Amino acid sequence: EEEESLAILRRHVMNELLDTERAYVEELLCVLEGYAAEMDNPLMAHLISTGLQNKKNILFGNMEEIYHFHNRIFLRELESCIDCPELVGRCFLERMEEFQIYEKYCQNKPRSESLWRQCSDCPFFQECQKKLDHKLSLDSYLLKPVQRITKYQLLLKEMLKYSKHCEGAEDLQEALSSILGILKAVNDSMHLIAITGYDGNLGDLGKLLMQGSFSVWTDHKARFKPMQRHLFLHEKAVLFCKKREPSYSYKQSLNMTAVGITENVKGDTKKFEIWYNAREEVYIIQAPTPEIKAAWVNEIRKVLTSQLQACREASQH
């Protein structure tokens, strides 16, 4: 049978989502009780440096914030769908604003890792672990939030699989796409936070739309010896960085204005070019694939279109 069989599979996924969810909450909690709360416990003070004590947030990030969310809102809302799993895509959608917390958590994560790398042996932790009777150490839990977002993606991807014809299939997709969005976001953010030497706050130049590596030549008015640069496509600019032999050193910017693009060059479908003025300034960028190139050129069109019409009806002021 069809319907009877699919529905039973959908219910199977809903169980995992809900089983793992509960576990997720429980996990974050034992760490906030088992470790975080303990950094503030007088009785434990003799095992914790006067400084590490402060690093409590650097180490945990907004885990608590995340915990309350999933404990007070999300789980409760996910469970409502126990009888109608096809429509669980509504929750994820309606809370994408709340999910922004994950971006904050990941952003801090690298620093946490630096700190953890520098004091993981510390007696304090060893103790908390005994008391908890944990086979594993704090670091494997600090990783839980990061993963949870992907589990969602996989689960949502699975739900839709057995719901293409159900009411809500629309939301499922949207939700799925959105999660993928958060993931792309988080991933791009990680690269941007590894940019060094950018005199100023690389936030006043719009949101990061794309980042990735390319080979760059400059036909301005070196044989075929390109530089390997990591590009960051923002709303107001395109940053060029060198990947340190992951980290990147800022090289130069390209004000996203008066820009002239060349959607196609002869030589390879992976070349497109960014240039300024009448072309006495030109950048030939080679993407790692003609596909990538497509996207970048495309995302760039959008920006100029946007950058452009960011005056068209904005000049009467």
Side-chain angles (χ1 to χ4, degrees), residues 1-188 190-317:
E1 169 55 53
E2 272 292 68
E3 196 43 284
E4 305 185 307
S5 295
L6 282 185
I8 197 173
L9 290 174
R10 276 195 294 284
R11 183 46 170 285
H12 271 31
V13 186
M14 186 51 49
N15 289 317
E16 218 192 319
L17 176 56
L18 259 39
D19 277 320
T20 56
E21 188 63 24
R22 298 190 176 81
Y24 179 58
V25 188
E26 297 179 54
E27 299 180 0
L28 298 187
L29 176 56
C30 77
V31 163
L32 303 174
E33 286 189 299
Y35 291 85
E38 291 305 290
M39 297 186 83
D40 297 307
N41 175 190
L43 302 159
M44 288 297 246
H46 70 83
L47 299 170
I48 192 168
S49 159
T50 57
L52 188 56
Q53 197 288 291
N54 297 176
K55 315 309 207 62
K56 195 233 277 198
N57 312 303
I58 298 310
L59 182 69
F60 286 91
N62 52 150
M63 181 170 294
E64 185 172 66
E65 174 177 46
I66 300 177
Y67 169 63
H68 296 317
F69 177 55
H70 290 273
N71 200 179
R72 299 302 176 200
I73 300 83
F74 215 58
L75 213 194
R76 188 247 122 198
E77 308 194 316
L78 284 171
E79 299 177 325
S80 69
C81 299
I82 217 304
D83 305 305
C84 51
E86 331 87 302
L87 17 158
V88 82
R90 191 75 239 152
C91 314
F92 288 93
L93 287 178
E94 289 193 19
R95 299 298 188 177
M96 286 297 283
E97 187 183 357
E98 286 81 343
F99 276 99
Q100 290 180 51
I101 65 178
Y102 277 92
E103 296 184 62
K104 179 183 175 181
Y105 185 71
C106 289
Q107 240 135 58
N108 179 293
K109 183 60 174 157
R111 176 171 190 186
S112 159
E113 281 178 47
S114 300
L115 169 43
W116 169 259
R117 215 176 300 134
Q118 194 66 211
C119 73
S120 68
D121 65 305
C122 184
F124 179 78
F125 296 92
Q126 303 185 301
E127 189 69 15
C128 294
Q129 192 167 330
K130 298 180 180 178
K131 303 170 67 169
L132 279 164
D133 189 2
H134 282 186
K135 201 167 185 287
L136 297 171
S137 54
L138 185 59
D139 63 308
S140 47
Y141 294 74
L142 294 188
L143 189 67
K144 291 301 168 193
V146 189
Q147 316 177 305
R148 195 58 187 149
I149 207 67
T150 306
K151 217 308 182 304
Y152 281 153
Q153 182 251 312
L154 302 167
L155 290 177
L156 275 182
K157 191 166 192 169
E158 206 65 11
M159 186 54 93
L160 176 59
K161 184 182 189 177
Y162 312 142
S163 300
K164 270 297 189 299
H165 270 56
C166 293
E167 267 171 47
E170 190 171 1
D171 278 315
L172 286 176
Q173 179 58 210
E174 254 189 293
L176 172 56
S177 311
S178 314
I179 321 177
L180 291 166
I182 309 193
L183 295 167
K184 187 206 162 62
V186 175
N187 191 69
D188 293 332
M190 296 312 282
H191 280 90
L192 190 52
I193 58 175
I195 293 300
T196 72
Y198 188 68
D199 52 292
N201 304 293
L202 57 184
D204 290 48
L205 44 57
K207 36 195 65 181
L208 186 58
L209 301 338
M210 307 270 273
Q211 52 70 43
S213 183
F214 302 85
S215 301
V216 193
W217 290 280
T218 58
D219 177 40
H220 298 168
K221 266 292 192 62
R223 183 193 180 70
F224 275 53
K225 201 59 168 59
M227 307 152 276
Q228 285 303 304
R229 299 261 160 306
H230 200 81
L231 307 189
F232 286 84
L233 178 278
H234 281 93
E235 268 181 331
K236 297 179 172 307
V238 166
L239 280 47
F240 280 59
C241 301
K242 204 173 199 293
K243 186 175 200 317
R244 190 161 87 192
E245 172 55 9
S247 208
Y248 316 87
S249 194
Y250 169 68
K251 279 298 186 169
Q252 55 155 151
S253 296
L254 292 197
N255 190 178
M256 216 56 230
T257 24
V259 82
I261 259 293
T262 299
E263 194 165 310
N264 241 155
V265 327
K266 25 293 149 191
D268 48 351
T269 31
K270 54 240 65 181
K271 286 187 194 196
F272 68 82
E273 69 187 10
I274 303 166
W275 48 268
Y276 286 79
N277 280 171
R279 284 182 55 81
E280 38 271 295
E281 175 165 340
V282 176
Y283 296 83
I284 311 69
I285 295 68
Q286 183 189 56
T289 72
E291 299 71 5
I292 286 143
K293 169 204 153 299
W296 274 73
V297 186
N298 176 279
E299 204 58 36
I300 291 178
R301 296 287 187 190
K302 299 174 71 180
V303 178
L304 286 350
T305 299
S306 164
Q307 210 52 180
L308 266 168
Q309 278 188 55
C311 307
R312 164 53 177 57
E313 80 303 70
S315 61
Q316 302 87 311
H317 322 182

